[PDB]
Enzyme design. Structure first.
Site, PDB file in Angstrom:
ATOM      1  N   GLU A   1       0.832  -0.924  -0.245  1.00 51.42           N
ATOM      2  CA  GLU A   1       0.080   0.139  -0.070  1.00 51.42           C
ATOM      3  C   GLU A   1       0.964   1.303  -0.230  1.00 51.42           C
ATOM      4  OE1 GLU A   1      -2.736   0.484   3.244  1.00 51.42           O
ATOM      5  OE2 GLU A   1      -4.569   1.280   2.462  1.00 51.42           O
TER       6      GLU A   1
ATOM      7  N   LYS B   1     -10.468   6.420   2.094  1.00 47.10           N
ATOM      8  CA  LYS B   1      -9.930   5.612   1.183  1.00 47.10           C
ATOM      9  C   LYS B   1     -11.203   5.356   0.554  1.00 47.10           C
ATOM     10  CE  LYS B   1      -6.138   4.873   3.958  1.00 47.10           C
ATOM     11  NZ  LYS B   1      -5.224   3.187   3.685  1.00 47.10           N
TER      12      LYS B   1
END
Ligand SMILES: Nc1nc2ncc([C@H](O)[C@@H](O)CO)nc2c(=O)[nH]1
Ligand SMILES: Nc1nc2ncc([C@H](O)[C@@H](O)CO)nc2c(=O)[nH]1
Ligand SMILES: Nc1nc2ncc([C@H](O)[C@@H](O)CO)nc2c(=O)[nH]1
Ligand SMILES: Nc1nc2ncc([C@H](O)[C@@H](O)CO)nc2c(=O)[nH]1
Ligand SMILES: Nc1nc2ncc([C@H](O)[C@@H](O)CO)nc2c(=O)[nH]1
Ligand SMILES: Nc1nc2ncc([C@H](O)[C@@H](O)CO)nc2c(=O)[nH]1
Ligand SMILES: Nc1nc2ncc([C@H](O)[C@@H](O)CO)nc2c(=O)[nH]1
Ligand SMILES: Nc1nc2ncc([C@H](O)[C@@H](O)CO)nc2c(=O)[nH]1
EC number: 4.1.2.25
Lengths: 121, 121, 121, 121, 121, 121, 121, 121
Positions: free
Chosen positions: H22, H100
């Site tokens: 990530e 997100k």
């Protein structure tokens, strides 16, 4: 000749479809109809009689979509294209797109459907 | 030649239309205008005189759309296409799409309208 | 008690409104309905009788919205809130929001409307 | 008292703003206006005189937004809230939200703006 | 040959444009890029070297869009099409669409822009 | 304490519902989950153990939504709120909103559903 | 022959891609599939056997998209087009569009992807 | 005191996050910032010094979001709220929402994130 008359995203609640539980419950059908019509005369005269009334077109589409449950989108679109080409001599061609945004298919998508184009001969 | 200049989703409040109560009340008209113009020269010189000013194009469209109430979209689009082809020699062709998202038609849809394409000869 | 039952963006073609040409032509009305109902019992039993049927709620709303033309959104919402509070004892409070996204107001906006909250006493 | 009258996403092209080039060029301003008004009387009588005319409200908002360039959104919203509270005794409170979706700020966002709430005393 | 590689709705803050205050303030530019590339080989080998890297394509587009202020969209698109056709032999043709959703034009619309198509010869 | 952890618009294909044909066919369920959790410690330490893992939260929600068909949204939301409050001590309160955008209700709307709030005691 | 069967915006979580961390994490893939099929027979008979079942088509697409991680969109689309053309004789041509709205490319855009068209010979 | 200054849907490409791949790849972060500031003085004087400059606020937010990779949204929002409350005395309270929309979670949703509210004391 590239001029068209269009009706976009018409939505009807109907019970059409192959699956029976599908006919039971029903769903929303979205319909796009595009007509190849020559518009420069009505463009010239500003008289509605020289063109195809989109209002009347919508009632025709609704009659079929909000009519007797049939199995296939292919068949539904076929009867709309006939109805329209037979009713309006000015229509050179009829395009009919029918979408099921939420059919009985497990998964994530925006829609599934068919599109046909039928010249008025 | 596939280059275009476009103005998309222009919105005007107007009173055009067949129905009189429609002329009374008015509604929002959405207009798309696409011009087939050859852009590689202005692409070469980065001089605006070599291309068609989209700013000026919009005022022309607004004059007509926010002008005298007429009956048909076919007629409205026709006068925009003329105005534009007559004003700009560089325009090989003018495409005019006019949509009524909320006309006086009882039902559920996204819009109804016409689209025409007019070569500048 | 913060639990609710909601029906969001219901759309009906109606002829309500102050202006007469407005009553003539009609328009789409969008309705939101939020019910303050205590849901932990139906949450416990998974039995529909312990909660308010949102299906039935919608037909009530449609009856009113697709009913006799009235002047004000304030009045339309008032009759929906009554109808609902009178029909369903479980409803502690009814919130009714009615929007006209395309009323006879010349200009550019997303919508205009009212919202009311009516306790069931 | 939780009833409101709202006007949502009104859009005006204006030249307000701190930066001068900003005043030069101008931009689109989006305005939300929410009025705390008690609606059960107009809800009772279906008479417009018992409530605040949202049509008239919009012209007031437009006068200010499409009026003389001022520096701050804070100031623009302040003059709308005054205008409205002074014109309409029935309004207990006025909430004014003004957004610039495309101000002179280099970056990626949906909008920036202010919101104020002004009781009518 | 109908296969394409596309990059859609790329957004850059730039200062391009005819008007000087426009160059001062800047705005968001949206760019679509479509490449006519034959994909069945990379489709066969699943090797990136057989196709055009869309990642690299984006940096090229950004260099130009986030580069020196120029006057016309026609010119901006021209330099992107060159850059791309010169860098990638596999590209048979490059289509470049540049939109200003919020240029200095007083009114209500979704966007204005140009689109060009440039064969790689 | 106003801090929250949220998961918004989770979509699952499920067969829940009162009607049997509804259980037969299934539909998409949209779920919002909001957790009242005090975040300043994890805000202080940047250590995940000090906060509730939203990833793990989603698998819990999916287990239930993509689990055995139940009758009511009230019941589905109840089991999610339990599961979550029982699994995570840090959660002071759990809010669960479940929407059916396309249930077996003939008409035009955006969705229908319930929302509950359940303190973790 | 202009009739089509389409499946639009199918979304799958997959791990395909050149970059390894990309294969690690995965992402959402959006897939459009358009089939050039002659529909007037099924349009005539309203029998599903005369047309291509869009339901079955979706499971095929999902098998591939939710299958073994491959490097390129070009390759993914190639295997879908094969699978479909080989399974369904009625399909004259298969068009496959695969978009990554959120690939590992730092910047602001709506999506990147490829589109291929494969006649069934 | 109900007045606010807001910045909505700010989008930054960052590498924050628990998972290492990530941090490798990165993603788009959407940030909403709402400031409880009393606006009637700037509303009175139309002088920017009497209010908090939303332009400056955005650069602060971007510094942090486009700054060193951290593990948690809780931590990112915490540093924005500090930065802002420490820089601007006029801010009574700072609300920070970070979403997100496309984190490494296999499934279908609109977004996941946190929201915090931090009084300036
Ligand atoms: N081409 C085409 N394929 C189809 N596949 C399945 C179904 C059924 O009615 C249902 O299973 C889905 O709605 N209908 C169709 C259809 O109408 N056309
Ligand atoms: N092709 C075409 N058909 C039309 N049908 C009805 C109306 C009327 O103005 C109204 O009844 C609806 O706006 N206008 C048109 C029109 O302008 N064009
Ligand atoms: N509060 C409130 N204000 C209104 N102003 C004008 C109109 C009229 O029906 C039309 O002019 C616009 O739809 N209706 C209302 C209304 O129903 N409520
Ligand atoms: N609170 C508040 N902050 C502001 N910051 C900058 C600007 C300027 O007009 C421009 O730089 C941006 O539009 N205006 C404002 C404003 O109107 N209000
Ligand atoms: N075809 C074309 N027409 C244009 N008209 C005005 C402007 C100016 O930069 C500004 O007035 C608007 O952005 N630019 C263009 C342009 O780049 N292309
Ligand atoms: N409050 C509440 N009302 C309901 N009304 C009808 C149905 C049924 O499952 C179906 O008829 C519609 O999905 N479900 C519910 C429900 O789950 N909750
Ligand atoms: N034409 C084409 N270009 C590509 N560029 C980069 C990547 C990689 O998988 C990643 O860097 C981005 O997803 N994939 C592709 C691809 O699949 N096709
Ligand atoms: N409350 C909270 N829960 C989280 N769960 C997982 C992750 C990780 O960075 C990734 O697995 C997903 O982005 N981050 C968070 C986070 O930042 N906050």
């Amino acid at each position: 000749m590239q001029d068209t008359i269009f009706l976009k995203g018409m939505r009807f609640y109907g019970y059409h479809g192959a699956l029976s539980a599908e006919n039971e419950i029903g769903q929303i059908f979205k319909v796009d109809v595009t007509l190849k019509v020559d518009l420069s005369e009505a463009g010239r005269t500003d008289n509605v009689i020289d063109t195809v009334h989109y209002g009347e077109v919508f009632e025709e589409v609704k009659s079929i979509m909000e009519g007797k449950a049939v199995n296939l989108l292919e068949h539904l679109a076929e009867r709309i294209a006939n109805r329209i080409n037979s009713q309006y001599n000015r229509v050179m061609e009829t395009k009919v797109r029918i979408t099921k945004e939420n059919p009985p298919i497990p998964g994530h998508y925006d829609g599934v459907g068919i599109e046909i184009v039928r010249e008025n001969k």
